[PDB]
C-alpha cells in the first residue's frame, strides 16, 4: 500500500519488484561551424530615427 | 517517578497514569530501525540536532 510499502523501504527490505531510475543532463558544449560561399542572401538596409 | 504505595501493585498505577501520554506519539529512540546515515540525512532525525 502506500503505507505498507512506506516501512519495507524504510527499513531496508526488497518488496519482490524492481525499479528503473531516469535523469536528466545538461552540458555545455563548443562547436565549429562550416559553410561553403554564397550560402544565403543577407540583405542590408535603412535605418529609422 | 519516586516509588508510592507497595511493589504489589505499583504496575497498575503506572499502567493507568501512562494510559494517556503513551499513545501520544512516539519515545525519543526510533533508531533502531534506522540505518546509518539515515541518522546523518537531514529528514528522518528530528533528534538529530
Known amino acids: 500500500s502506500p503505507v ?14 524492481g525499479f528503473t531510475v531516469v535523469r536528466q ?7 565549429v561551424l562550416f559553410s561553403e ?3 544565403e ?4 538596409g535603412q535605418l529609422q530615427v | ?7 504489589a ?3 497498575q498505577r503506572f499502567l493507568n497514569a501512562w494510559r494517556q501520554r503513551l499513545a501520544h506519539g512516539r519515545v525519543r529512540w526510533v533508531a ?6 539515515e541518522q546523518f540525512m537531514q529528514p528522518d532525525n528530528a533528534n538529530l540536532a
Not at chain 2, 1 to 7: C, L, M, N, Y
Open chain 2, 32 to 37: 533502531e530501525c534506522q540505518m546509518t546515515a
Open chain 1, 37 to 39: 560561399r554564397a550560402s
Open chain 2, 9 to 11: 501493585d505499583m504496575q
Open chain 1, 4 to 17: 505498507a510499502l512506506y516501512h519495507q523501504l524504510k527499513t531496508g527490505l526488497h518488496p519482490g519488484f
Open chain 1, 25 to 31: 543532463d545538461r552540458f555545455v558544449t563548443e562547436n
Open chain 2, 1 to 7: 517517578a519516586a516509588p508510592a504505595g507497595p511493589g
Open chain 1, 41 to 44: 542572401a543577407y540583405f542590408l
